[PDB]
Amino acid sequence: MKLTIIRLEKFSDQDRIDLQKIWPEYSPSSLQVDDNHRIYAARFNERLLAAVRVTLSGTEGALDSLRVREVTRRRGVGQYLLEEVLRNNPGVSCWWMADAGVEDRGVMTAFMQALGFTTQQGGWEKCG
Ligand SMILES: CC(C)(COP(=O)(O)OP(=O)(O)OC[C@H]1O[C@@H](n2cnc3c(N)ncnc32)[C@H](O)[C@@H]1OP(=O)(O)O)[C@@H](O)C(=O)NCCC(=O)NCCS
């Protein structure tokens, strides 16, 4: 079982629907990425199991939003994905994770602490 993390360089209307299924509060924008704003899609067996948006502004890593499917509250997928990103993106020493006003942040921080992130003055930081 390997989580296939794909980079969303092109958005079909099929992807469009499933993305809105992951973010039911998000009105369908243009869905437009660049070499900095990089949206990665973790598809486990063809289907979206997790979605994360990382804005690599230069060599700085800004992690905004991350949603794994609700049922996947413990299946390695989340940490696997985060580690995978940090293992395939070298040089980026400053990983900054936004809180995004998430209320499941209690659970999120528990995930963060057990994975290897620290909370500093308004968000999670991982310099390394
Ligand atoms: C929270 C969430 C990431 C758990 O997803 P996941 O892919 O199962 O995460 P993992 O399986 O990698 O993490 C389980 C590990 O995280 C840590 N952890 C601690 N508390 C945890 C918790 N309450 N839930 C999940 N992981 C937790 C542990 O180290 C655990 O390791 P273990 O399985 O060996 O015990 C998933 O439910 C999710 O993404 N939901 C929220 C998406 C969302 O709405 N986010 C807002 C973006 S605005």
UniProtKB/Swiss-Prot annotation:
Q: Give the residue ranges for region: Interaction with PanD.
A: 43-48, 66-76
Q: What happens when the gene is disrupted?
A: Deletion mutants are deficient in the biosynthetic pathway for pantothenate.
Looking at the UniProt entry, the stretches that span the membrane are: none
Q: In this protein, which residues make up the domain named N-acetyltransferase?
A: 1-127
Keyword S-adenosyl-L-methionine attached: no
Give the activity regulation note. Answer: Activation of PanD processing occurs even at low CoA concentrations. In contrast, full inhibition of PanD catalytic activity only occurs at sufficiently high CoA concentrations.
- Record function comment: Controls both the activation and catalytic activity of PanD in a coenzyme A (CoA)-dependent fashion. Binding of CoA or a derivative to PanZ leads to interaction with PanD, which promotes the processing and activation of pro-PanD, and subsequent substrate-mediated inhibition of the active form of PanD. Inhibition of PanD activity is probably the primary metabolic role of PanZ, allowing negative feedback regulation of pantothenate biosynthesis by CoA.
**HAMAP family reported for this sequence:** PanZ_PanM
Family designation: Belongs to the PanZ/PanM family.
Q: How does it assemble?
A: Interacts with PanD in the presence of CoA. Forms a heterooctameric complex composed of four PanD subunits and four PanZ subunits. Monomer in solution.
What name does UniProt use for this protein?
PanD regulatory factor
Encoding gene per record:
panZ
